[PDB]
Amino acid sequence: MKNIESLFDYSAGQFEFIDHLLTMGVGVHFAALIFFLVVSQFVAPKYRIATALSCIVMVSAGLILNSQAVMWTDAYAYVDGSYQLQDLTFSNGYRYVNWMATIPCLLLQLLIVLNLKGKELFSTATWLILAAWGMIITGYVGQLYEVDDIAQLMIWGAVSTAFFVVMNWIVGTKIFKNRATMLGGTDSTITKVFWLMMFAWTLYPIAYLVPAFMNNADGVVLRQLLFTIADISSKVIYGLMITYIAIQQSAAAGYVPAQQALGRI
């Protein structure tokens, strides 16, 4: 049960573009990691964990993107005018394993800026993480068959989509029922984060389906391109909005370092 990446030889332009996409993603996440670390001091204690979760996400994704880059250059060699598969192996499956950690972190930092606490926070986080883990795990099993069994990729993806929809319903319901509690005008900002999340996370099932409608070397490139757009949107851009909401609410709650931080800009 191979992946479609192992099926093709690659032109130098295709190979280097994919490598440059992954290495670019590493640099963006580690550059954002520094930003999230420095602005941590400008967030009130109640919200500071949300910015720390951005730091964990940046290193988690950055390590897996660097991992994918070197595996790409390990597994292929330029022979007779094209990059051909060598002794080693490349696989998008390590992305799925990493999602088991990064997705709960992304969801947790949203619940924190929604001002959920105590029993409701733990309760809502447990249902969301369980739904997300069911989405990822059924998706992982599905892509094992992206070459061998296209019908199984479809059926496991339908199961995965059911968890995805239920997960989004919980997220959206909590957002619209707790919007009134949010400070500094961030009741307007949080609805924008929900829509950004809808857009960015939907890119992943689209990349999952690439083997069904573009099973060639250019579809390998398009999938990595979609992953890159989705990774930056769902982690970096999303994290900046979460951090903005965290600081804005900190300032409205009387945190002086937050108020000063916004004043200078």
Ligand SMILES: *C/C=C(C)/C=C/C=C(C)/C=C/C1=C(C)CCCC1(C)C
């Ligand atoms: C930073 C990485 C993120 C936010 C990854 C998100 C992943 C998903 C939303 C996964 C979606 C899937 C389905 C809805 C159906 C097909 C299989 C998956 C696992 C790709």
Ligand SMILES: CCCCCCCCCC
């Ligand atoms: C600003 C510190 C970010 C530097 C990123 C390092 C890129 C490593 C590419 C292998």
Ligand SMILES: CCCCCCCCCC
């Ligand atoms: C207030 C407790 C949060 C529960 C929201 C809905 C959970 C989904 C059960 C599937």
Ligand SMILES: CCCCCCCCCC
């Ligand atoms: C289709 C997944 C979208 C779920 C959003 C529902 C939010 C409305 C709650 C009032």
Ligand SMILES: CCCCCC
């Ligand atoms: C060996 C492929 C990577 C999957 C990790 C469980």
Ligand SMILES: CCCCCC
């Ligand atoms: C997998 C089909 C679910 C769609 C529900 C809106």
Ligand SMILES: CCCCCC
């Ligand atoms: C035009 C690109 C918008 C980026 C905002 C973060």
Ligand SMILES: CCCCCC
């Ligand atoms: C310096 C706080 C602003 C964060 C959002 C870009």
Ligand SMILES: [Br-]
């Ligand atoms: Br506080």
Ligand SMILES: [Br-]
């Ligand atoms: Br990730």
Ligand SMILES: [Br-]
């Ligand atoms: Br409602």
